[PDB]
Amino acid sequence: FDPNAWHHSQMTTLEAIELSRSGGHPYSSPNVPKGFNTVVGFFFDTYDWYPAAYDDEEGNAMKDRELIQYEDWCAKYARTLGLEVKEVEAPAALKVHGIMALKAYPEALLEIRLIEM
Amino acid sequence: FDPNAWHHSQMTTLEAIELSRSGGHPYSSPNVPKGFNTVVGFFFDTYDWYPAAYDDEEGNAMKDRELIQYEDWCAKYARTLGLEVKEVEAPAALKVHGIMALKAYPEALLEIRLIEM
């Protein structure tokens, strides 16, 4: 374990630790229109991120079987319900895995899937 | 057994039995636009109705605690999501309790609450 190593969250290990202790996370997208969020963003806005969360995935949250399911569900119901879906820039921690952009869904839809079910 | 005694579903006892045996129910509304349905309509379109279902309520399905919850849920999320909500004529089995109209929600919204949850 090295303190100075670059963490897969695209910051120093120390910075990752400070970020997690402050209740933050690295997976928020920039310039997300108000009332929208990405699945991964809303998930860690709700639940706690800890630096070792995606060690096995080398930081690629979008390999999480849990988050993939949520993403598939949100895509499905936003379409059948005629909801607006926005495209937003991926966070650096996902840009480094080849994900350039993410779908952002209405927060009410995320609330149903991520909190109620 | 009186086959011609009036059932609270607003048909003869015999008629209610025959309707139940054919997989029908008395709680559908007339002239519901395609892709919409009421809570009570969708519920019994999904699950089996039997004549004695609402003996205790003298046929007022909208006194069912479950169905009240589903209705409250759909009104809440239809509003927050900005979904279209239509007003439709109540079926006779509810007009007899003073309910003149029911709210009709998008079928996708009903699928979530009544089947997935």
Numbering used by the authors:
A (entry chain H), B (entry chain A): 17 to 133
Paper text:
Here we identify two Brucella abortus effectors, NyxA and NyxB, that interfere with host protease SENP3, and this facilitates intracellular replication of the pathogen. The translocated Nyx effectors directly interact with SENP3 via a defined acidic patch (identified from the crystal structure of NyxB), preventing nucleolar localisation of SENP3 at late stages of infection. By sequestering SENP3, the effectors promote cytoplasmic accumulation of nucleolar AAA-ATPase NVL and ribosomal protein L5 (RPL5) in effector-enriched structures in the vicinity of replicating bacteria. NyxA/B are two Brucella nucleomodulins impacting the subnuclear localisation of SENP3 and subsequently of other nucleolar proteins such as RPL5 and NVL.
To gain further insight into the function of NyxA and NyxB and their interaction with SENP3, we solved the crystal structure of NyxB at 2.5 Å. The asymmetric unit of the crystal contains 12 monomers of NyxB, but no significant differences were found between them and thus, only the structure of subunit A is described hereafter. The NyxB model encompasses residues 17–134, suggesting that residues 1–16 are flexible. NyxB has a mixed α–β fold with five β strands and six α-helices with a core made of helices α2–α4 and a small curved β-sheet formed by β3–β5. The longest helix α4 interacts with α2 and α6 and is connected to the core via a loop containing two short 310 helices designated α3a and α3b. In particular, a β-hairpin formed by β1 and β2 packs against α5 and anchors α1 to the protein core. Search for structural homologues (DALI server and EMBL fold) did not reveal any significant homology and thus makes of NyxB structure a prototype for this protein family. The association of dimer 1 (chains A and H) buries a total of 530 Å2, while dimer 2 (chains A and J) relies on fewer interactions burying a total of 400 Å2. Analysis of the NyxB surface revealed an acidic pocket delineated by residues Y66, D80 and E82 within an acidic patch consisting of amino acids D72, E73, Y70, Y86 and Y63, residues that are strictly conserved in NyxA. In the context of the dimer, these surfaces are juxtaposed to form an extended concave negatively charged area of around 2000 Å2.
